[PDB]
């Protein structure tokens, strides 16, 4: 029998509830963390929030023309009229996405705004058979759809080096020497439960919205294909994770093209 | 009469805020940037450490006296409709600590009003004697959250060197700060002074509890009828300065500055 152990792990902080079910064992809904819907900090992170440092567009339309400055910063605006990535979007090597911000002349409903509108897909936390907790979609998700953001505690590399648990870190790539990461161990959203898959249906993309401090991109997961209702979400953890954890366990994603077992 | 803007906020508020001018030929104001939340130019080291937040451990709707956030606010002053209780001291308002993301309660608990944003149907309009003003297009019951005074967070040192001081809101306290809505602000930058105000500003804390930076929320002091202009008491610092230049045009029989 499938036990509903939570009607909403986000307790109303998302646009829709995220229930938790367990049809496997007697484990209750996870509670060793604090759910937050947006990134937080403990030690200060001096994000550049000077409004005059934002690059912005002066579009007089819905930011669907070639002249949009924010589209140019993203090479081009990759969103279609429904907010989904165009098929030309390179998911093997995603570019930086600069969404429109509060300094732009455009309206809040312009085309170049997707991730800033929050989680919309109906997801469900559930107990897997051999990978702990996982996240599944309760609905069909078309390809190129924004699913969720990897939310957690913004910490420096120096802080990440003294944390005992490293299984919930997401490294923030930046050309500058200073490096940071998102730790979802103590504070995080639904994305902290997404398991690794070697042929993933999700791809992380670095996105900038209210600020453009390149040290702190926000991590948005987009669907790489049609995700059918009931299917578990997964993304590629990368080589750093498996270089560390491979000596502890092999990958259990079950793909015929598994690269870590 | 003459609609000069369908929405001065460009969709950043829950409701459009149109602008009309039935008085003269002035177009919609455009010498500023509309922002729906406070911004900064020079950095402000607001304490955003999540472990520094006081929070409640309520298992209900935060309607009991055990709610930590209510105790910080002396008590929770919101009724089930989100309006201030009749016991609220409009003459000397307390600090309001709304529930935050560190609390164990849900996003729809009783102690959350200002963080839900502007809801009332407002309208920017041209007055006959004091430039632009804001009016309500609907009846607003007493104790209702109307709007927040939004703008650029600046220090006292910065405020003392700004040529235009007509859009400052002082955040009183050693180090003191203020909100300058001259270059960046929301609809509240157009609210005029009235000696019989129907709005009262209240200092509110939500996502952070850095007492240097309270957010300014306007609540109705009485039933505001549809079509009535919004107004609050600018205070004596404003009128000690600007009284040398002009007199108050609020038109009240109890006007104190004309
Ligand atoms: C100098 O001071 C400011 C500098 C900037 C401002 C505003 C400023 O205030 C001026 C105050 C003057 N007072 C006017 C009345 C009395 C005094 N505008 C912003 C944003 C504009 C859009 C809305 C959000 C703010 C961007 N950054 C800024 N300079 C860049 C703008 C774009 N150029 C070009 C290369 C394209 C690069 C430098
Ligand atoms: C095990 O998987 C990772 C492990 C580490 C990572 C990243 C990892 O997976 C990222 C992808 C998987 N995610 C899973 C959920 C979401 C994606 N990050 C780094 C740097 C962090 C800061 C930014 C630059 C890279 C540090 N080293 C790590 N663990 C060490 C921490 C300190 N301990 C002891 C010294 C106490 C030794 C191991
Ligand atoms: C009114 O009394 C309750 C009202 C609600 C409760 C519990 C309640 O009991 C309190 C008394 C209990 N007795 C006291 C003695 C013994 C038990 N529960 C919550 C949560 C439900 C999910 C699990 C955590 C608590 C949400 N719904 C509630 N109404 C809200 C709906 C939204 N409004 C706003 C729009 C203003 C805020 C009130
Ligand atoms: C004119 O009305 C005010 C004038 C001033 C205020 C506040 C005021 O109105 C507040 C209420 C009215 N609002 C209107 C919209 C919303 C409420 N605040 C202060 C301090 C700011 C923060 C630290 C403590 C107080 C600075 N001095 C002030 N003007 C000077 C600035 C520097 N210039 C230079 C030329 C030298 C000389 C005049
Ligand atoms: N493909 C995979 N194969 C084996 N274990 C995996 C896996 N993907 C994720 N995991 C497990 O999940 C951790 C990532 S955190 C992901 C959520 C986790 N399943 C939970 O219940 O909290 C990894 O450290 C590993 O222990
Ligand atoms: N009660 C009042 N009497 C006369 N002028 C007033 C007033 N209340 C506000 N004002 C004018 O408005 C300024 C405050 S900013 C308020 C908006 C302003 N009416 C505008 O059109 O931009 C004051 O400096 C004063 O010039
Ligand atoms: Zn644009
Ligand atoms: Zn833009
Ligand atoms: Zn735009
Ligand atoms: Zn695998
Ligand atoms: Zn509470
Ligand atoms: Zn609460
Ligand atoms: Zn609380
Ligand atoms: Zn008056």
Q: Radius of gyration of chain B from Cα atoms?
A: 19
Cα atoms in the Cβ-side hemisphere of radius 13 Å centred on B90: 19
**Phi, psi (5° rounding) for residue B201?**
-80, 135
Q: Is B41 on the interface with A (CB under 8 A)?
A: yes
Beta partners for A123? Answer: A137
Residues of B in contact with A12 (CB under 8 A): 106-108
Q: Does residue B46 sit at the A interface (CB-CB below 8 Å)?
A: no
d(CA B152, CA B109): 30
- Ligand 2 binding pocket (C-beta < 6 A) is A 157, 160-161, 163-164, 166-171, 179, 181, 237-238, 240-241, 244-245
Across the interface, of A12, A43, A153, the residue whose CB is closest to B107 is A12
- CB–CB of B108/B78 below 8 Å? no
**Whether the CB of B66 sits within 6 Å of ligand 3:** no
- Distance, in Å, from the CA atom of B48 to the CA atom of A41, rounded to the nearest integer, reads 7
Distance CA(B142)–CA(B110), nearest Å, equals 18
**What's the CA gap between A201 and A198, in Å, rounded?**
9
Report the alpha-carbon angle A155-A159-A162, nearest 5.
140
3-state secondary structure string across A46-86? CCCCEHHHCCCCCCCCCCCCCCCHHHHHCCCCCECCCCCEC
Supply the CATH number for residue B252's domain: 2.170.270.10
Question: Phi and psi dihedrals of B215, rounded to 5?
Answer: -100, 145
Residue A165 CB burial class (10 angstroms; 0-12, 13-18, ≥19):
exposed
Q: A63 and A84 in contact (C-beta within 8 Å)?
A: no
> Exposed, middle or buried, A143 (CB in 10 Å: 0-12/13-18/19+)?
middle
Q: CB of A169 within 8 Å of any CB in chain B? A: no
User: How big is chain B, counted in residues?
Assistant: 258
B78: which strand partners?
Answer: B84
CA of A37 vs chain B CAs: smallest distance (Å): 8
User: How is residue A157 written in tokens?
Assistant: 């590399």
Nearest-by-CA chain A residue for B185? A102
Place of tokens 């929405």: B7
Kindly state whether A13 is in contact with chain B, defined as any CB-CB distance less than 8 angstroms: yes
Q: Quote the CA–CA distance of A51 and B40 in Å, as a whole number.
A: 6
Pairwise CA distance, residues B55 & A88, whole Å: 47
Question: Could you tell me which residues come within 8 angstroms of residue B244 by beta carbon, excluding any fewer than 6 positions away?
Answer: none
Q: Which residues pair with A188 in a beta bridge?
A: A35, A152
The residue count for chain A: 261
At A13 the three-state DSSP class reads: coil
Q: How many domains does chain A have?
A: 1
Q: Which residues contact B230 (CB under 8 A, 6 or more apart)?
A: B122, B133, B134, B135, B136, B146, B191, B192, B198, B199, B218, B224
Nearest CA in chain B to A13: B107
- DSSP for B81-108, written as a single string: TSPBPTTS-SSSPPPEE---TTSSS-TT
Q: Is A244 on the interface with B (CB under 8 A)?
A: no
* Distance of alpha carbon B158 from alpha carbon A186, whole angstroms: 39
Closest CA to A102 of B43, B13, B47: B13
Contact B189, B96 (CB under 8 A): no
User: Which amino acid residue places its CA nearest to atom 13 of ligand 1?
Assistant: B183
Question: What is the distance of C-alpha A247 from the center of its chain?
Answer: 27
Point out which residues pair with B140 in neighbouring strands: B224
Neighbours of B58 (CB within 10 A): 22
Which of A142, A160, A136 minimizes the C-alpha distance to A19?
A136
Closest CA to B50 of A220, A49, A34: A34
Q: B35: burial class by Cβ within 10 Å (0-12, 13-18, 19+)?
A: buried
Quick check: A63 and A111 in contact, CB under 8 A? Answer: yes
Tell me, using a 6 A CB cutoff, whether residue A252 lines ligand 5: yes
- What are B82's two structure tokens? 């989100």
B50 closest CB neighbour out of A48, A106, A187: A187
Is A216 an interface residue toward B (CB < 8 Å)?
A: no
> Which tokens sit at B52?
């520094």
Distance CA A214, CA A172 (A): 9
DSSP string, B122-147: EEEEE-SSSSEEEEESS-B-TT-EEE
> Do B168 and B178 contact (CB within 8 A), yes or no?
yes
Write the DSSP symbol of residue B1: -
Of residues B208, B191, B210, B190, the one with CA closest to residue B199 = B191
Residue B250 near ligand 6, beta carbon < 6 Å: yes
Q: What is the resolution of this structure in A?
A: 1.6
| DSSP-derived secondary structure letter, B52 | G
What's the start-to-end Cα distance of chain B, in Å?
30
Give A202-254 as a DSSP string: EEEEEEESS---TTS-EEEEEESS-B-TTPBPEE---HHHHHHHTTT------
User: Buried b / exposed e across B101-139, counting CB within 10 Å, b at 16+?
Assistant: bbbebbbebbbbbbbeebbbebbbbbbeebebbbbbeee
Helices (H), chain B: 68-72, 156-159, 236-242
B183: enclosing H helix or E strand = strand B177-185
Q: How far apart are CA B196 and CA B182, in angstroms?
A: 25
Residues B38 and B42: their CA atoms lie apart, in Å, by 13
The answer to whether A65 and A57 have CB atoms below 8 angstroms apart is no
How far is the C-alpha of A113 from the C-alpha of A100, rounded, in Å? 6
Helix (H, G, I), strand (E, B) or coil at A261: coil
Question: How far is CA B89 from each of CA A74, B84, B120, B145, rounded to the nearest angstrom?
Answer: 51, 10, 23, 15
Binding positions of A are 57, 59, 63, 68, 70, 100, 104, 106, 110, 131-133, 168, 195-196, 198, 251-253, 258
Residue pair B171/B214 in contact (Cβ under 8 Å)? The answer is: yes
d(CA A92, CA B13): 37
Set of chain A residues whose Cβ sits within 8 Å of the Cβ of B10: 106-108
Tell me the CA distances in angstroms from B206 to A38, B20, B98, B130, B143, one per residue in order: 15, 33, 5, 34, 19
Rounded to 5 degrees, φ, ψ at A122 are: -80, 110
Q: Does residue B42 contact residue A50 with C-beta atoms inside 8 Å? A: yes
> Which residue do the tokens 């907790």 mark?
A133
Rounded CA separation B11/A93 (Å): 34
Domain enclosing residue B211, as ranges: 1-258
Burial A48-76 (b: 16+ CB within 10 A, else e): ebebeebebbebeeebeeeebbbbebbee
- Tell me if B138 sits within 8 A of B169, measured CB to CB: no
Structure letter (DSSP) for residue A96: P
> Mutation test of the interface with chain B: which of A6, A8, A11, choosing the one with the most B Cβ atoms within 10 A?
A11
d(CA A87, CA B226): 51
Cα separation, B81 vs B69, whole angstroms: 18
Pairing relationship of beta strands B177-185 and B168-171 according to DSSP bridges: antiparallel
- Alpha carbon of B225 to those of B20, B135, B140: distances in Å? 18, 10, 6
Token duo for residue B199: 């709005």
Angstrom distance (rounded) from CA B110 to CA A62? 38
Tokens of A89: 């979007």
């Amino acid at each position: 029998v499938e036990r509903i152990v939570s009607r909403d792990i986000a307790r109303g902080y998302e646009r829709i509830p995220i229930p938790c079910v367990n049809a496997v064992d007697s484990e209750p809904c996870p509670s060793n963390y604090k759910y937050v819907s947006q990134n937080c900090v403990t030690s200060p992170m001096n994000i550049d929030r000077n409004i005059t440092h934002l690059q912005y567009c002066v579009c007089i339309d819905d930011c669907s023309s070639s002249n949009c400055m924010c589209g140019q910063l993203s090479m081009r605006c990759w969103y279609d009229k429904d907010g989904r990535l165009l098929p030309e979007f390179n998911m093997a090597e995603p570019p930086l996405i600069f969404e429109c911000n509060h300094a732009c002349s455009c309206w809040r409903n312009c085309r170049n705004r997707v991730v800033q509108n929050g989680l919309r897909a109906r997801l469900q936390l559930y107990r897997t058979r051999d990978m702990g907790w996982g996240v599944r979609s309760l609905q069909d998700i078309p390809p190129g759809t924004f699913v969720c953001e990897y939310v957690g505690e913004l910490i420096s590399d120096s802080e990440a080096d003294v944390r005992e648990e490293d299984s919930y870190l997401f490294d923030l790539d930046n050309k500058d020497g200073e490096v940071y990461c998102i730790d979802a161990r103590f504070y995080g959203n639904v994305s902290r439960f997404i398991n690794h898959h070697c042929e993933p249906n999700l791809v992380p993309v670095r996105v900038f919205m209210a600020h453009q401090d390149l040290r702190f991109p926000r991590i948005a997961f987009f669907s790489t294909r049609l995700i059918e209702a009931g299917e578990q979400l997964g993304f590629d953890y990368g080589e750093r994770f498996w270089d560390i954890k491979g000596k502890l366990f092999s990958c259990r994603c079950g793909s015929p093209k598994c690269r870590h077992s």
